[PDB]
Design a protein around this ligand. Sequence first.
Ligand SMILES: Nc1ncnc2c1ncn2[C@@H]1O[C@H](COP(=O)(O)OP(=O)(O)OP(O)(O)=S)[C@@H](O)[C@H]1O
Ligand SMILES: Nc1ncnc2c1ncn2[C@@H]1O[C@H](COP(=O)(O)OP(=O)(O)OP(O)(O)=S)[C@@H](O)[C@H]1O
Ligand SMILES: [Mg+2]
Lengths: 350, 351, 192, 192
Amino acid sequence: LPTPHEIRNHLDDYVIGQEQAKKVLAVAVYNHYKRLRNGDTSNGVELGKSNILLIGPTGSGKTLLAETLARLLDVPFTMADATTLTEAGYVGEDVENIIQKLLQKCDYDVQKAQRGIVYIDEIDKISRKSDNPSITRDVSGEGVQQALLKLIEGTVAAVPPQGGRKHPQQEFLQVDTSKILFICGGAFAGLDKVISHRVETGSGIGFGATVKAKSDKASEGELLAQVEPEDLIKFGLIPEFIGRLPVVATLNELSEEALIQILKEPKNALTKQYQALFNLEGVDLEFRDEALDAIAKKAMARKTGARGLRSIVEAALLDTMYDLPSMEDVEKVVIDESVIDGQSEPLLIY
Amino acid sequence: ALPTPHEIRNHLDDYVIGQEQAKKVLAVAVYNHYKRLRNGDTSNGVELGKSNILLIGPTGSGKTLLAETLARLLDVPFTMADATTLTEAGYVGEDVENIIQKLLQKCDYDVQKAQRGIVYIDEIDKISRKSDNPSITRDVSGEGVQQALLKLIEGTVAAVPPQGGRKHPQQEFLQVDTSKILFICGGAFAGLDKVISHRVETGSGIGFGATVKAKSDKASEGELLAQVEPEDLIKFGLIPEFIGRLPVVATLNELSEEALIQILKEPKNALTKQYQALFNLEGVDLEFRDEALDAIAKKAMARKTGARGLRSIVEAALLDTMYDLPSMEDVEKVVIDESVIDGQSEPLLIY
Amino acid sequence: LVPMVIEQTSRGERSFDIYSRLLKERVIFLTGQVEDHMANLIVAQMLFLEAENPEKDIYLYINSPGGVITAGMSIYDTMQFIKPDVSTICMGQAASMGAFLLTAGAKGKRFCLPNSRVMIHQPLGGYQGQATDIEIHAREILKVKGRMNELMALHTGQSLEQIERDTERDRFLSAPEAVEYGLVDSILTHRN
Amino acid sequence: LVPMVIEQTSRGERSFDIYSRLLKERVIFLTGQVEDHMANLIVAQMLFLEAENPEKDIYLYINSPGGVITAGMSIYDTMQFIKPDVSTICMGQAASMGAFLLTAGAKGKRFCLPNSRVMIHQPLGGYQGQATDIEIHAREILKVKGRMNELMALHTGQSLEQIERDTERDRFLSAPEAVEYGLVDSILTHRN
Ligand SMILES: Nc1ncnc2c1ncn2[C@@H]1O[C@H](COP(=O)(O)OP(=O)(O)OP(O)(O)=S)[C@@H](O)[C@H]1O
Ligand SMILES: Nc1ncnc2c1ncn2[C@@H]1O[C@H](COP(=O)(O)OP(=O)(O)OP(O)(O)=S)[C@@H](O)[C@H]1O
Ligand SMILES: [Mg+2]
């Protein structure tokens, strides 16, 4: 029902630098709901199902996009992680409880549950692995992928309502999984290696050949966009699982400009967090416009996405924070680009 | 009132010698944690976020010692865990949720106090992968453990039995958010120095323009570790997601000969004082010459066991004396000198 | 007989000849009389190393009494073409062509051993035949003489007139004298 | 024909030529007339061993009748540049260059067999051409003669004047006589 522009506008407020990814997600969810309104597809041909695969690097807003999307959509939104999931009958967990968790949000009503959305974070952590002699059995892996795949194929799931007692009592509320949107978002670390081996032309040796220096060799960005089913299978994903997910939303490493906005634009930005911390002690904190550029440059080198920003700030402010409570006559503290480099000390106003 | 970082560091200085950087990071982290608890996220429109610490350091550098000493002055409930015991979900070994269960026991199963708690995870390097590649076969104690910790570090409700985990429908597991639980992961990442050296050091060739150090001029483990970056941990085996959860990185330095000499007498619980008390209860006085302490430091450094090496040297020097001292009589004082450390002469006995 | 050495690698033990092992470390040996075949071999090594890593610097150990000019130009042109900086080290001696290649190295990366001996002279050639043919070949060698002097002046930094005077006859320069003339930058006395 | 020997290692048995097997033990063989080609080979062997272990001492067996000066200086400068102490040993004989390289070894690590014969003489050279060119080449051999005598005095410890008188003509020194002169430090009669 919500227009793609409206969906993208809401995500843009909380997400910065993922305009391309947001467009795919908005169109996918909008098309999915349209199909639900129509009955029997309204035509001979069958409309393709909408299953998104949020593949992206660490700290790229994968979880943020799913969490912020639930606020806009009135449908019930549940979040699970494939790491916790294990084969049925084992000490870890059961995959079927995901449907039950979704029902809890909407007080066990099948009508609302069918229109709900699911977000399986850390999907890459359940990639198929070879057998280990020491281990009794590989509970986590392809076995878990089969249970999740069954829900995508479309199957009614029996759920006991109102927290039914151990007595069966034949309640078994059936909730169809064909209309329930399934989203799997995980950071496929190492996928770049297999993708590069397939799409890298190589460096020639002659005078007229093209020499590729390590500087401009390649990067994960512009490489994941060429992802294909064959590379995902090598990672460990089941081929049937990949076919069931036609929509693929691939995120890109945040740029220097994008990181600068996150430092100050969000309400819960890193700079505002420390400002409130300093204010609790009776001092005000000020960040120069040039300092943000330096912090973003250092964070990009760390390759930890948004989380890298906290590392740079904590290191630069480690010395002052240690001595600021003991010091007196300090009413204002200012930080600039030179302080970020470490050559200079945090400026103090007296 | 709120203790300042300097006050917190003073306590650590009493028990730990030479780890100035680790004390500052720990003191600042404890100082910030107290402020969040002292001033709940009620008035501030912005919600304060936590910063986890990664205590990298060689053996016998004081990593474990710092955590123990911290609990003495930590008003907040604190507990220590072992990463080796931890295993991923679905396996017989253990579960990450058990860590939270131990923390609740300290506060008598108080959910509110447990949420605002400090946890220490020793031997975090043991669960590191062998290489940057994810795995060849399922790893129950390895990357799998790190994958389960991601939700725990960032924040999520943890299921723990309220009292005994019995006679309860569905076990009545208590749900405690771990978003505000500061985590300190200290481990001795053996072999990380060569990884850092690979990128830091270049030009290792055979010709005239190559760089040859002869193993004497090469950078030491302490110096190399100080230049640690996240990219280096990727090659060592740490998951990229796990590193992001730990922004703060603290590097401890190798104990020098001078530092070891101070550790023998300066700390509150020193090696010399331990043996001295052993003699006091039996009616004898133990005296160590200043030169003797210097000799012990040199021998301990060669062992490569850090502070633990000092114990071995003292045991060997006093091995024979301790064996015959109780049966002997008219023993009022024992003096140890540099000659005893070398093994040239027997320790002087006062009759 | 060339000896064989063992190199420890992740895959396992590997056997290399002493020259190939050094080639792996970006070291090319220029030894003996310069000629078409040895020059083409050196050219192949420069191109091969460029592809492996165009950022790292290549090294050239020159111990030669000189040779053909045309063969030397193939090496000189290849050095300037490829992106990697070529560091030239003189071992034993460097005659007319060896010296031209020595000074042609990257500015700041040209080295010389303390007891090395460098010599620079003008081109020498000869032709037998008709007077008309003599005039043709005579003009060609003079052009090469001017071209070689113009390039040496650029690398050494000396004036063109000075080079013509000094190269008119054989001139021997020691390692310290070469530094002043501009043929090399520094001397490698001991490992630091 | 060079024989092949088997070396037992943890990985397994490996086949090595007799010269390569000794190279693994930091032993370099200098044999025959010195020249640019064999000299570069020795240089490569020295640099290779320096990288493997710059602390362990290298060994250079010398049984040669001498040769080109320039080729020898490459070996001499390489021995002094690298960190490892090069222990020279004289087998059979050591002529002008073999002796200059022998005495160039690390102090206290120069040896000679009891029946070895050392010989030192001034440089040999010649040139044919114009009187001007003759003067140019004549000054170089004189400088080389003076430069070589200076280095011999530094290693042997004898005065420069004495070296000039003794090196004017071929002088043969037995193993004991060489010890007194300073070319060598000790004699290896039997294994203790
Ligand atoms: N595009 C973004 N805009 C603003 N903040 C962001 C963005 N991406 C990440 N962050 C910040 O980083 C935090 C974590 O973001 P996540 O969505 O968890 O990144 P991630 O890619 O999911 O990391 P993982 O470990 O692979 S799930 C968020 O709570 C934000 O504070
Ligand atoms: N800085 C120090 N000052 C004083 N004593 C120290 C110091 N570092 C180590 N010690 C001594 O060494 C003992 C063990 O120290 P630990 O903190 O366990 O070392 P470590 O960093 O934990 O190394 P591990 O356990 O192998 S990872 C302590 O109980 C002290 O007696
Ligand atoms: Mg420890």
